[PDB]
Design an enzyme around this catalytic site. Sequence first.
Site, mmCIF file in Angstrom:
data_model
loop_
_atom_site.group_PDB
_atom_site.id
_atom_site.type_symbol
_atom_site.label_atom_id
_atom_site.label_comp_id
_atom_site.label_asym_id
_atom_site.label_seq_id
_atom_site.Cartn_x
_atom_site.Cartn_y
_atom_site.Cartn_z
ATOM 1 N N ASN A 198 0.837 -1.196 0.000
ATOM 2 C CA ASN A 198 0.000 0.000 0.000
ATOM 3 C C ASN A 198 0.876 1.251 0.000
ATOM 4 O OD1 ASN A 198 -2.456 1.587 2.162
ATOM 5 N ND2 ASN A 198 -2.613 1.231 -0.052
ATOM 6 N N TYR A 208 -8.078 12.692 -1.229
ATOM 7 C CA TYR A 208 -7.788 11.922 -0.029
ATOM 8 C C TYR A 208 -7.415 12.864 1.111
ATOM 9 C CZ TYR A 208 -5.439 8.551 3.074
ATOM 10 O OH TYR A 208 -5.058 7.796 4.157
ATOM 11 N N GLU A 248 -11.165 9.173 7.732
ATOM 12 C CA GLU A 248 -10.381 9.098 6.499
ATOM 13 C C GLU A 248 -11.378 9.219 5.348
ATOM 14 O OE1 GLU A 248 -8.755 5.188 5.432
ATOM 15 O OE2 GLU A 248 -6.860 6.112 4.853
ATOM 16 N N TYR A 287 -12.418 9.903 1.014
ATOM 17 C CA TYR A 287 -12.054 9.707 -0.387
ATOM 18 C C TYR A 287 -13.102 10.305 -1.323
ATOM 19 C CZ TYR A 287 -8.677 5.905 0.753
ATOM 20 O OH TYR A 287 -7.607 5.166 1.195
#
Length: 185
Positions: free
Chosen positions: A35, A69, A78, A80
Amino acid sequence: ASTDYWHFWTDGGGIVNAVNGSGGNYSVNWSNTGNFVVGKGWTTGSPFRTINYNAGVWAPNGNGYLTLYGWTRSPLIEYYVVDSWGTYRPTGTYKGTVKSDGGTYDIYTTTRYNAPSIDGDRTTFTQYWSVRQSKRPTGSNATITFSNHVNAWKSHGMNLGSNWAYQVMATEGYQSSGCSNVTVW
């Protein structure tokens, strides 16, 4: 204003080559990775910001996202806004849709447990996703009116934190290789 922040993170898996170019331009060239997230944007995110970008190269071979992001704290979130992707379309718990910047986005939440975040490696937090129903064409100037997403998320009971961390137009990958080039303003 224009971009003031450079984001480069890799979990150490594979090879991630990035260029912090002039202005809001950057590029990524990655091979057989774990990642990673690479992008340009702002040290302090804003719910009122309209992000402009042009992805001159979008070429993931496998799982890669071309995505706004960022993070908030209080609560820890978090988020997106995914405009394009490779072999994998990211989804979560379906909430509804939002129409913004000529596209229709599916809205998702995913809560993560004992998971890495900006606050530690074993934290709990929710991901807020807006994911375009089809891949956005790349190579021309594109807008993400982030306030539309903030607004729609809030209407679906998805509240962002009051403390804003970084906010970038990013290339994310997992278990993939690829070529990418993006200018952000």
